[PDB]
Amino acid sequence: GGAKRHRKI
Amino acid sequence: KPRVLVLTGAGISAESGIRTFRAADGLWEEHRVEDVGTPEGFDRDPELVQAFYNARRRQLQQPEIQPNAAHLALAKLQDALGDRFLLVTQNCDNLHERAGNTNVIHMHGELLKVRCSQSGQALDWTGDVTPPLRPHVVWFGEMPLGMDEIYMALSMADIFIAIGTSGHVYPAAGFVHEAKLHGAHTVELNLEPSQVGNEFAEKYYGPASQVVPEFVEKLLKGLK
């Protein structure tokens, strides 16, 4: 789960 | 009949005239995601962000924008499977609904809805947003919608199909792994191999308008 997040930080 | 869970992303609506995120950059409609796709972007320049989504909302409702063959095939799939079918989309468009699907889970929200930010209530909205209301759209750093029902369906699925999604954005990109953990057969249908394509047991590449009806037809005929 977790928040919507992109593979690069 | 098998329990089928379908995940869709922007690629299934590309051929319908809704342009996709160009991977070459970090830009959406010539905008940086940080500026139009984060809560922070909204706080710093609310009127630009409201204008950006006002534009997306209008473009969505233009006559030349319609469901394509891929959207239609998923409506036929739901017709055949009933409550053993669940469609989850990352898209904010309404093309699944216009194609005939029902109970579509919009885990990243909907362009045709806005949200009164004090409340949690989403409200139907088809026009511009003027002068605080915000788009009912899940931004980076925010929790996707409907996750409880999605993860339940992932644990129950006999077949998990991911369509038109690049595997960059979590948690959606992790659904294939979760499905595999609970024994589902996994299928990737996409223009090109995704970032997580290696996780899928079965895969077909090409434009969604061709690949999805082909796969759906093969699935439906294997039933009978």
Ligand SMILES: *C(/C=C/C)O[C@@H]1[C@H](O)[C@@H](COP(=O)(O)OP(=O)(O)OC[C@H]2O[C@@H](n3cnc4c(N)ncnc43)[C@H](O)[C@@H]2O)O[C@@H]1O
């Ligand atoms: C947050 C906020 C939105 C307002 O979410 C959006 C989006 O929902 C999320 C996930 O992105 P995704 O839906 O996976 O889309 P892309 O990362 O842009 O990848 C597109 C995907 O589609 C394929 N594709 C393009 N064209 C086609 C056709 N004709 N047929 C099939 N597939 C196609 C590309 O090859 C990519 O794999 O991130 C955002 O923040």
